[PDB]
Structures are given as C-alpha cells and as structure tokens.
Design goal:
Layout (H helix, E strand, L loop, with lengths): L2 H8 L3 H14 L8 E2 H11 L5 H11 L6 E2 L1 H9 L7
Antiparallel strand pairs: 1-2
Bound molecules: calcium ion.
The site of calcium ion has 7 residues, from strand 2.
PDB class: structural protein
Keywords: F77W, troponin C, cNTnC, structural protein
Assembly: monomeric
Length: 89
C-alpha cells in the first residue's frame, strides 16, 4: 500500500470516488467475483486507443497488486489512478 497515494485520493471529491467505483464496476461486468485480470484488461486497452503487449500488462499490475494475487481490485485500482497525480517532473 501507499499512504502518499491514499492521502491525495482521500482528499478527492465525492464525484471522483463515485466515478472510480463506477468505471471499475463496468470493467468487472464480465467477471464473476468482481475483478480485472491482465487478460481482459488488455482487451479494454483497445478502447483507450492503445494495444500494449499481454505480458507487459501484468508488468504494471505487479507493482500495483500489493497482494500479488494476479489481478487488480477496486482498492489497488482506485489508488492506481491517484498514482497518476504524483506523476510530475
Ligand atoms: Ca490484488
């Protein structure tokens, strides 16, 4: 986990948290338990306009998955976006 990311995500707006919880549910719409595997995550990438390799997907998911279960949950997912905020020169 990362307190630096949760600190910024926690100070977010109600609309933000609601958005992540929504977009996340739309992605897991195919799953049965409610998660996103690198296998499917790669397919959705097409929507964004990018088509990264399959093995590369799990790469970014490795540093994200704190439990290393092999998939991204609503928890690791939400923080995933927040991490994009700290991405500055
Ligand atoms: Ca996980």
């Amino acid at each position: 986990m990362d307190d630096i990311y949760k600190a910024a995500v926690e100070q977010l707006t109600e609309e933000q948290k609601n958005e992540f919880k929504a977009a996340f549910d739309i992605f897991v719409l195919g799953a049965e338990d409610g998660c996103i595997s690198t296998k499917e995550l790669g397919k959705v990438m097409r929507m964004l306009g990018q088509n990264p390799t399959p093995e590369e997907l799990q790469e970014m998911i490795d540093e994200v998955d704190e439990d290393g279960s092999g998939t991204v949950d609503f928890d690791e997912w939400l923080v995933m976006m927040a991490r994009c905020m700290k991405d500055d020169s």
